[PDB]
Amino acid sequence: GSDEFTAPAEKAELLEQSRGRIEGLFGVSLAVLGALGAEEPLPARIWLQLCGAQEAVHSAKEYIKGICEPELEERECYPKDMHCIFVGAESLFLKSLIQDTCADLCILDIGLLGIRGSAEAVVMARSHIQQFVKLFENKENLPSSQKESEVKREFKQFVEAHADNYTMDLLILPTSLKKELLTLTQGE
């Protein structure tokens, strides 16, 4: 399918530069359309055409609108030991979160994320991160189970496939958080 919408003309260079990224994130194709009829139109906006699967195009449109004309820009604080989630595993958890929420997520400092885009994308992203933090914080010694071992094994295989300086920090995350992180990446 395809969707046509506008962006401020000034964002032409941004969108041209970001085509690759946007396709890589959402699996869509992005083109900037012409402006015919001799005369420049009043709003000075450029038309974009997105092509691909329906929900993929919907997500990408929301992201593109978010980075061109964000409705919200917010911060999110998180515990320092959770930082591995956002910079570890070759940034794949952060990438999945961007794909899932359609918010633009930026690592500002250890323990600090910047979140921008459409209001609903930003609201969703913040809610998801606060939820990760909740799982991370109330962690205590808990029951052993086969189900726990399968999640730990699956999580370890994923992170070991993308090994870096954060691998050990990721491996000591609570199993509940590991499960939500797997859900997040496998859903994308």
From Swiss-Prot:
What tissue specificity does the UniProt entry give?
Detected in heart, lung, brain, liver, skeletal muscle, pancreas, kidney, spleen, testis and ovary.
Cysteine disulfide links: none
Q: Where in the cell is it found?
A: Cytoplasm, Cytosol; Nucleus; Nucleus, Nucleolus; Nucleus, PML body
- Post-translational modification (record): Proteolytically cleaved by CASP8 downstream of TLR3 or TLR4, leading to its inactivation. Cleaved by caspase-like protein MALT1 in T-cells following TCR-mediated activation, leading to its inactivation and subsequent viral reactivation during HIV-1 infection. Mono- and polyubiquitinated on the CoCUN region. Monoubiquitinated by NEDD4. Polyubiquitinated, leading to its degradation by the proteasome. Sumoylated with SUMO1, abrogating polyubiquitination and subsequent degradation. Desumoylated by SENP1, leading to accumulation in PML nuclear bodies.
Q: Which residues form the KH-like domain?
A: 54-138
Q: What induces it?
A: Up-regulated in response to interferon alpha (IFN-alpha) stimulation (at protein level).
Q: Subunit arrangement? A: Interacts with NEDD4. Interacts with ITCH (via WW domain 2).
What does this gene product do? Potent suppressor of cytokine production that acts as a regulator of innate immune signaling and inflammation. Acts as a key negative regulator of select cytokine and chemokine responses elicited by TRIF-independent Toll-like receptors (TLRs), thereby limiting inflammatory cytokine responses to minor insults. In response to more threatening pathogens, cleaved by CASP8 downstream of TLR3 or TLR4, leading to its inactivation, thereby allowing production of inflammatory cytokines.
- Describe the family membership recorded for this protein in Swiss-Prot or TrEMBL: Belongs to the N4BP1 family.
Q: What is known of its domains?
A: The CoCUN region mediates binding to ubiquitin. Does not interact with NEDD8.
Q: What is this protein called?
A: NEDD4-binding protein 1
| Organism, as annotated | Homo sapiens
Gene name, per UniProt, is N4BP1
